[PDB]
Amino acid sequence: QVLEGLDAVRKRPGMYIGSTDGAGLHHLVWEIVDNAVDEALSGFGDRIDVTINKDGSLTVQDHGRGMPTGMHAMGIPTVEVIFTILHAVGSSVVNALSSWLEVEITRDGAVYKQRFENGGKPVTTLKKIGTALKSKTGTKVTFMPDATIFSTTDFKYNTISERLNESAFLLKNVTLSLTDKRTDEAIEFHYEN
């Protein structure tokens, strides 16, 4: 396995997300949502909340275990390695094709955050920003797709709604929600079994 930096994704985005049109834009959403879904499939977290923010960014929040908060080699946070090294893998690809991205992790009574800008360059380390109840766990990822890469940066409520509905049906017993702050639209899906 040859590891690569995020420049490899930015120079050949179609290789990783298929295209740079609306289909490619939404593949970014699928990658972030699918990580939360995978956690829930393993029994960690029973709701996944997606928000299309007023500024055009998108947030996915889950209540899974929380991504690793520890260190890799050289005092580099494990989360930074996940978001900045291409193991060519979804997280790093989204970061590469975003003008900014924030990851917030809650676990063990602490809330941590790291911010990346301009195609995934870290502008902070993983820093403790606050506290929470010891029971509270989860990951929140917010990203702004890079307008210099995509021909459209407009997330489509109906497209995302449909995908989240399908994911809720396949998962069972997990609530998926979508809120659009541009229009105030909102919906929730949950299938009991």
Ligand X SMILES: O=C(O)CCc1cccc(-c2cnc3[nH]ccc3c2)c1
Positions in the binding site for ligand X (CB under 6 A): 35-36, 39, 62, 64-68, 139
Which residue from 20, 31, 89 is spatially nearest to 60, judged by alpha carbons?
31
Q: What residue has token string 């991205």?
A: 101
Which residue from 51, 71, 72 is spatially nearest to 60, judged by alpha carbons?
51
Q: Which is nearer to ligand X, 65 or 72 (CB)?
A: 65
Alpha-carbon span 189 to 175, nearest angstrom? 6
Q: Cβ of residue 34: shortest distance to ligand X, in angstroms?
A: 9
What are the residues facing 86 on neighbouring strands? 4
Torsion angle of the four alpha carbons 29, 40, 46, 98, in this order, in degrees rounded to the nearest 10: -20
Q: Cβ of residue 169: shortest distance to ligand X, in angstroms?
A: 20
Q: Cβ of residue 176: shortest distance to ligand X, in angstroms?
A: 14
Alpha-carbon span 104 to 126, nearest angstrom? 9
Q: Which is nearer to ligand X, 64 or 120 (CB)?
A: 64
Q: Cβ of residue 141: shortest distance to ligand X, in angstroms?
A: 7
Q: Which is nearer to ligand X, 20 or 175 (CB)?
A: 175
Residue with smallest beta-carbon separation from ligand X: 35
Q: Which is nearer to ligand X, 52 or 105 (CB)?
A: 105
Cα atoms in the Cβ-side hemisphere of radius 13 Å centred on 96: 26
What one-character DSSP code corresponds to residue 134? T
Q: State the Cα angle at 177 between 156 and 144, rounded to 5°.
A: 45
Q: Which is nearer to ligand X, 76 or 182 (CB)?
A: 76
Q: Which is nearer to ligand X, 62 or 146 (CB)?
A: 62
Q: Cβ of residue 68: shortest distance to ligand X, in angstroms?
A: 6
Q: Cβ of residue 108: shortest distance to ligand X, in angstroms?
A: 9
Alpha-carbon span 193 to 172, nearest angstrom? 6
